[PDB]
Amino acid sequence: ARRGALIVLEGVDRAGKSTQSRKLVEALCAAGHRAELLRFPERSTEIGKLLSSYLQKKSDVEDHSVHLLFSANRWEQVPLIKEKLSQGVTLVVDRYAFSGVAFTGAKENFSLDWCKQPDVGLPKPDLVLFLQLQLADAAKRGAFGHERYENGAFQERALRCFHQLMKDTTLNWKMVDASKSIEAVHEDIRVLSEDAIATATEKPLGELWK
Amino acid sequence: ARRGALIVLEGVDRAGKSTQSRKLVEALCAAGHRAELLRFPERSTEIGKLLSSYLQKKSDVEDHSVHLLFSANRWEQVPLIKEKLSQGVTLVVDRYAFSGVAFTGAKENFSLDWCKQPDVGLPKPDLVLFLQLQLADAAKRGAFGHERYENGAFQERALRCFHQLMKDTTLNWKMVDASKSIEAVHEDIRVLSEDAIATATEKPLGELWK
């Protein structure tokens, strides 16, 4: 009956969202929690394959259409998310609706309001971690990628959108200094996550942006 | 330079949306207009096939996800719609965003506001025809179908949603008595359409619900 927590990891490019989400699930399970990992986009579904082809530049998709497919890709996982949480399983998610708004919101003539609407009503995270890293430190972690959106100019506009989203006080945002070592960042994230898991059993799962 | 008009046909089940859209395009072209037919859902695209499988009950899709796919299926045709209109081609469309809101809006716990958002900003129709028919007269036109949403209880909830949408004065709604003969309904629609085509060359294409 004691529900699991919904924990989201957001963050700048190469700050370590995927490395930290994997390590968090491993550590929680080793400490006796029931925890599982999710990511968005979830490329395994029918909509997920359309999204993967788009990000790889194997296909072009009209900007509004692709924004709605990224949102639909979250909604198709909502029945699973609510089932797992109600069963006491904590979910750790590598990117969520915040990345959806920030990446479309970085394109010309896309307001933050329009971008948020499709995701209104999704399961509300109990904890949103944002992994911060200065661009000099990110550069040492590798060269850009060949997927769509992998260029500094675009990443910088998405970052401004993320800062606008962080003003929303309906959400439990926590900043994480992702400039430290893999292990030191993990310990900071893990302690914040243990606290969130404990309190989530106290209030019902909320709805995002409503 | 004289743009074409965007004309939408909406209406109750079996009122004749598809019969009248076909006959309208044929008559406009015979009278010297450049006119072409479109329909939604457009089942030929990747998203269109997902939608067709859902309507045929060959697959189940989560309600929010399917609502966003119906909207994305309109946005993927926006570059074509704007190109055609700018080239002076009038477009006659069998269903549009109004059916999108009314059909999802008929399901439990779906507000009209949430349903409208994804379609905010689409090309705004210059003329929205709504084909009205009493349920007794519809029954004589055949038996229900085996596709999703083909049942009187659901169609009745969608009808209430359409009436809420008709209160919006930003749109040029025209009621059509679809109880007459195929030819008499066509003449009423055709005369309204000739008037709309003439004035559309006067004002820029608008944006829906904004």
Ligand SMILES: Nc1ncnc2c1ncn2[C@@H]1O[C@H](COP(=O)(O)OP(=O)(O)O)[C@@H](O)[C@H]1O
């Ligand atoms: N704290 C860290 N210090 C040094 N390298 C890191 C750190 N976190 C991640 N990395 C490395 O940087 C790269 C990007 O990490 P990744 O977790 O894939 O980031 P994201 O998912 O945020 O793009 C990987 O090679 C990873 O091993």
Ligand SMILES: Nc1ncnc2c1ncn2[C@@H]1O[C@H](COP(=O)(O)OP(=O)(O)O)[C@@H](O)[C@H]1O
């Ligand atoms: N005015 C009308 N009078 C009689 N039958 C009609 C009329 N309009 C359409 N029909 C018939 O009713 C059926 C439904 O028409 P259709 O155009 O497919 O409706 P919709 O697309 O609105 O469901 C078809 O068999 C069609 O021939």
Ligand SMILES: Cc1cn([C@H]2C[C@H](F)[C@@H](COP(=O)(O)O)O2)c(=O)[nH]c1=O
């Ligand atoms: C969830 C989500 C991710 N992205 C983008 C962000 C990024 F460029 C890309 C691949 O994500 P990973 O970096 O996590 O591989 O997908 C979007 O553009 N919208 C979304 O809704």
Ligand SMILES: Cc1cn([C@H]2C[C@H](F)[C@@H](COP(=O)(O)O)O2)c(=O)[nH]c1=O
């Ligand atoms: C455009 C549109 C149509 N429909 C529904 C309405 C109907 F039951 C179905 C098939 O449409 P046709 O009746 O025009 O075949 O699809 C929706 O549910 N949402 C939409 O956005």
Ligand SMILES: [Mg+2]
């Ligand atoms: Mg990653």
Ligand SMILES: [Mg+2]
């Ligand atoms: Mg039809």
Ligand SMILES: [Mg+2]
């Ligand atoms: Mg609003």
